[PDB]
Design a protein around this ligand. Sequence first.
Ligand code: GTP
Length: 333
Amino acid sequence: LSPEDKELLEYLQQTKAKITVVGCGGAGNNTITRLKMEGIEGAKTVAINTDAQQLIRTKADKKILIGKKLTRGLGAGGNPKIGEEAAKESAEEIKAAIQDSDMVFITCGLGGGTGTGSAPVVAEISKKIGALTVAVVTLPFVMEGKVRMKNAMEGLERLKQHTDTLVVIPNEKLFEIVPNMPLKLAFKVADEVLINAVKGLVELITKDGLINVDFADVKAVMNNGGLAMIGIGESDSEKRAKEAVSMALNSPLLDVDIDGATGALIHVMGPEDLTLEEAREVVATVSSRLDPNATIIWGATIDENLENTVRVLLVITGVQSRIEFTDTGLKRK
Ligand SMILES: Nc1nc2c(ncn2[C@@H]2O[C@H](COP(=O)(O)OP(=O)(O)OP(=O)(O)O)[C@@H](O)[C@H]2O)c(=O)[nH]1
């Protein structure tokens, strides 16, 4: 290299795109374990919990037992205030774990005491250290009771204050995607949706695909993404891409009017035969549903184990104006 280049290269050393995924509580730890095992690209995994038992069986690059003094390696018994206090007690440890992150993804299942209470604290620390802060959480199933939903919605309001983009997945809508879903599989299905949303979002940024995804562009869209919801579709039919995206756009997970969306993140995943043209069609389709002024970030990657199905992850941002937060859940205005 040359003097100019050598300098630049060194610059590239300091600069980067450090991404960290933080799973709080049992549901959050379960998600992290999966990401670590199946291997998530270009991202560090961090699991935190008050419950030492759940944490020890979890798998991640780093684990943080929060609230030692407060809970003594025990769970929060459903009390969000314990999770919040616990996270505060361990702020320094959490800070050390996500310290040099350019972007932090916070994931958990809202409704319990740990995830609900600590997620907002992790988010506050994430922004204070200057990282693009994104949350991807789930709301509980109706069958879990109103207390769990209230605590979740309150935690959702608190989280909303400290995140740059808050992606919310309504577990209850999973029953609209698979009507005859056996209760014993309800959480195994939610698990699948959570992983696809988080891994899908993370890899859209870190995984090499048929087209480059610029981190700066991702920042611009998510810096003020506000409240976001997802849509998931997949098809192996003649018009794989067309059907997949149609499924995503009509997904019950995307429970809101999207015409008033400020932006979107689109991740097209398919087998080795996936072309840029299919991905283009997915994006073209989505763009016609959103405001003509919305910013759309998209990518297309190859998923080794897909065979001949194309999957589409959609993330519509800035829909807070079309949603209302109630103690019973999210309601479309
Ligand atoms: N996908 C998924 N969601 C889960 C699972 N377990 C529970 N949930 C959901 O996540 C919410 C919070 O549960 P946990 O993560 O177990 O709770 P916690 O944050 O650890 O809180 P405490 O046990 O009170 O300390 C529940 O209300 C369910 O909606 C799981 O295995 N997978």
